[PDB]
């Protein structure tokens, strides 16, 4: 009748692993090369030197006081930025 959603949701326990990894390794250093090299092509309007300072600051404020997955969430968002060709920062 309705409880089909119960049949659905209990069927969407779906423990395909996916905990955001919380990168505690050089993986952070990868993007901070890929970013400043993928940005260095695009920063026509916005400042090239303001943009480095904020990627620094985001790589401490998110490392300092956040959780595990939300750091694997931020890092995944670093991946999805240049995948989105940028964070629209033109």
């Amino acid at each position: 009748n309705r409880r089909r959603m119960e049949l659905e949701q209990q069927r969407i326990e779906s423990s395909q692993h996916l905990p955001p990894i919380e990168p505690t390794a050089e993986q952070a250093c990868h993007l901070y090369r890929r970013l400043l090299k993928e940005g260095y092509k695009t920063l026509v309007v916005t400042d090239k030197d303001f943009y480095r300072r904020k990627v620094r600051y985001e790589l401490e404020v998110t490392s300092r006081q956040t959780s595990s997955r939300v750091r694997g969430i931020m890092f995944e968002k670093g991946h999805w930025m240049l995948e989105n060709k940028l964070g629209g920062i033109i």
């Binding site: 779906s14 395909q16 692993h17 996916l18 955001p20 990894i21 505690t24 390794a25």
Partner: protein, 144 residues
């Protein structure tokens, strides 16, 4: 039309024609009950005469439709007759051909061919996102 009374002008021939986009399934094999103002009763007075499809409804000799509306007591039998008499020939060209610019045939497969490619990326997002993580996990299980 339904709300039309008595005669059928040469205009609402258009209103019948314009509205053939929103009826793509319809064909000369469609059941007569799909006809403007061909309600429940009139159909049963039609079926009693072995008349089923829009196509046969165009064959009536102005005397079946007359003895229908004036002897079988089925009303508005003239505003339905002129309807099948109107869309049969643009529907008859649906028996032989579908859309002419629909199709865009080289396009219609490239829309279909990618929908597999597309709806197989979410299912794989359930996989590609985690197996890429499983590695980013196993890449560090060793470093310590």
């Amino acid at each position: 039309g339904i709300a039309t009374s008595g005669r059928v002008t040469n205009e609402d021939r258009r209103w019948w024609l314009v509205h053939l986009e929103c009826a793509p399934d319809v064909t000369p094999g469609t059941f007569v009950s799909w006809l403007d103002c061909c309600g429940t009763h009139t159909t049963k007075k039609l079926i009693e005469r072995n008349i089923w499809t829009i196509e046969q409804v165009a064959e009536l000799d102005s005397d079946r439709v007359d003895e229908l509306k004036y002897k079988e007591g089925c009303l508005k039998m003239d505003v339905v007759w002129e309807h099948a008499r109107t869309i049969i020939t643009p529907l008859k060209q649906r028996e032989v051909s579908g859309g002419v610019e629909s199709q865009l045939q080289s396009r219609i497969l490239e829309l279909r061919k990618k929908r597999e490619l597309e709806r197989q990326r979410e299912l794989l997002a359930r996989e590609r996102a985690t197996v890429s993580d499983k590695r980013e996990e196993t890449l560090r299980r060793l470093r310590e």
